[PDB]
Amino acid sequence: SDKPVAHVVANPQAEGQLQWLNRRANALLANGVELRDNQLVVPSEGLYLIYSQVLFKGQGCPSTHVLLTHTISRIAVSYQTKVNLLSAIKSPCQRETPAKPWYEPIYLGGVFQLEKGDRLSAEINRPDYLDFAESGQVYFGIIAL
Amino acid sequence: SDKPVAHVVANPQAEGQLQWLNRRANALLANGVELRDNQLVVPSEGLYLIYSQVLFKGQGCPSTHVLLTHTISRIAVSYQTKVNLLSAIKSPCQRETAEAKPWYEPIYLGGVFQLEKGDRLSAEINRPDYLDFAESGQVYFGIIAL
Amino acid sequence: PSDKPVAHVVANPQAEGQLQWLNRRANALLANGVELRDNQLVVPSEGLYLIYSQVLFKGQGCPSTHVLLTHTISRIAVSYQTKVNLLSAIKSPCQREAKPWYEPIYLGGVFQLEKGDRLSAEINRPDYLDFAESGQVYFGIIAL
Numbered sequence: 029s030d031k032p033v034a035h036v037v038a039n040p041q042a043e044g045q046l047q048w049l050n051r052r053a054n055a056l057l058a059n060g061v062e063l064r065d066n067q068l069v070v071p072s073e074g075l076y077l078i079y080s081q082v083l084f085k086g087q088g089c090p091s092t093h094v095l096l097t098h099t100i101s102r103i104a105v106s107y108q109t110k111v112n113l114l115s116a117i118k119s120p121c122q123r124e125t126p127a128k129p130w131y132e133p134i135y136l137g138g139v140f141q142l143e144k145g146d147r148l149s150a151e152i153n154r155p156d157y158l159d160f161a162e163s164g165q166v167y168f169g170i171i172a173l
Numbered sequence: 174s175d176k177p178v179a180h181v182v183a184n185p186q187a188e189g190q191l192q193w194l195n196r197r198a199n200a201l202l203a204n205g206v207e208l209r210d211n212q213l214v215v216p217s218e219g220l221y222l223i224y225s226q227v228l229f230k231g232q233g234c235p236s237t238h239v240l241l242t243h244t245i246s247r248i249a250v251s252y253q254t255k256v257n258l259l260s261a262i263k264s265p266c267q268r269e270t271a272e273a274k275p276w277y278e279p280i281y282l283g284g285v286f287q288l289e290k291g292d293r294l295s296a297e298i299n300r301p302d303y304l305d306f307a308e309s310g311q312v313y314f315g316i317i318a319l
Numbered sequence: 320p321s322d323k324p325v326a327h328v329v330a331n332p333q334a335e336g337q338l339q340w341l342n343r344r345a346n347a348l349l350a351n352g353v354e355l356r357d358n359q360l361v362v363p364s365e366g367l368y369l370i371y372s373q374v375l376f377k378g379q380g381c382p383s384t385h386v387l388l389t390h391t392i393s394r395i396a397v398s399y400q401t402k403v404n405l406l407s408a409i410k411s412p413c414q415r416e417a418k419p420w421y422e423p424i425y426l427g428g429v430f431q432l433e434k435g436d437r438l439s440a441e442i443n444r445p446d447y448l449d450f451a452e453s454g455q456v457y458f459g460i461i462a463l
């Protein structure tokens with residue numbers, strides 16, 4: 029099979045940052061897909077499934093409203109045009125402020141027309157809340173249709 | 174040299190409804206797959222990957238009893254019945270009432286199935302009044318022959 | 320007629336408080352060499368595979384302490400029988416008379432597998448599993 033695919037996971041060695049890596053146990057890059065500057069590089073034109081999941085955790089609810097964001101964006105090689113493909117906002121806290129641990133997952137996915145050389149990023153606003161407790165809760169991937 | 178495929182997308186102009194479209198970018202319908210009677214028509218017998226995604230948005234949480242469902246069904250050409258292939262239920266609310274915030278909930282379904290020629294697939298939701306087209310974020314239904 | 324190893328297993332509605340997978344039943348299947356041994360999918364050949372799973376949790380009202388729901392797909396390597404997580408998720412259905420709640424968990428990805436590898440799809444709270452209707456809980460693979 030010649031189908032361009034990628035399944036990348038968070039690097040535990042770069043805690044405090046969301047750094048994607050093609051880890052030995054459960055991650056990969058195949059059939060031309062590359063991982064450069066924390067981005068997935070598309071080898072050829074066509075429709076692709078782009079999916080992701082990040083998990084936020086904390087202990088108790090502090091001051092004001094904690095806002096959690098997760099965004100998937102595209103950089104086209106032509107005009108270096110950046111566009112938002114998928115995005116979501118979550119507020120984990122609501123009048124707790126005493127403490128008990130909370131969990132907030134963000135999952136995103138969709139089918140998009142990509143061009144050869146396009147770069148995809150999957151970013152978060154609060155890397156300090158990113159959970160590293162288990163092996164495969166935070167991942168980012170592409171599957172050509 | 175090519176296999177039957179379909180990637181149909183929901184009509185944003187069909188208010189409070191889930192209406193599928195092939196006549197769009199980037200909607201696909203090839204090698205015998207037909208979009209007929211808001212359903213996908215299987216062109217030949219074999220193994221298929223069936224998948225869908227829907228997005229729900231609610232204005233706030235007046236009660237914790239709000240229930241969201243998304244179901245892919247098979248209407249078999251022979252016996253002519255409606256059987257569930259894939260289904261999911263979600264409760265988007267936990268208390269709230271003070272100001273109310275809009276919520277967003279995606280639902281994903283998909284699997285491999287042995288299908289027969291001429292049988293039909295439907296992808297439905299219980300609350301089409303909650304359906305949304307935001308970036309959280311996509312509404313489609315598709316089949317890929319293996 | 321496709322030569323690709325594939326599988327689509329569903330939870331047994333007769334296995335109370337257990338998550339026990341069943342095949343070639345209603346719209347379930349095992350094909351082109353995929354086996355079902357000790358509740359795990361046995362990979363028949365080397366290569367890239369699409370792996371996916373869904374589980375549904377139901378509960379009547381929220382009780383004492385915080386309820387945590389988990390769903391995990393694991394890889395047990397043929398050579399050393401080592402068990403590594405491929406995909407995992409955590410959900411909290413309760414946020415502090417009878418009030419039923421519903422929580423679905425869907426996992427999916429692309430993975431390089433070897434011949435002889437075993438795949439499990441497990442949950443922490445089988446007492447909350449909901450298989451009352453048909454396409455509510457499933458596990459499967461498709462070879463690229």
Ligand SMILES: N#CCc1ccc(-c2cccc3ccncc23)cc1
Pocket residue numbers: 077137171172173222223224225226281282283284317369371427
């Ligand atoms: N080959 C290939 C491309 C590809 C891979 C996976 C899926 C898919 C599988 C199961 C569930 C889904 C839910 C939502 N969207 C997509 C889903 C669709 C297309």
Ligand SMILES: N#CCc1ccc(-c2cccc3ccncc23)cc1
Pocket residue numbers: 079080081135136137138281283369370371425426427428429
């Ligand atoms: N068959 C097969 C493999 C597969 C199936 C479904 C998905 C998927 C689709 C849309 C959104 C997602 C968000 C988070 N994780 C997974 C998602 C990815 C891969």
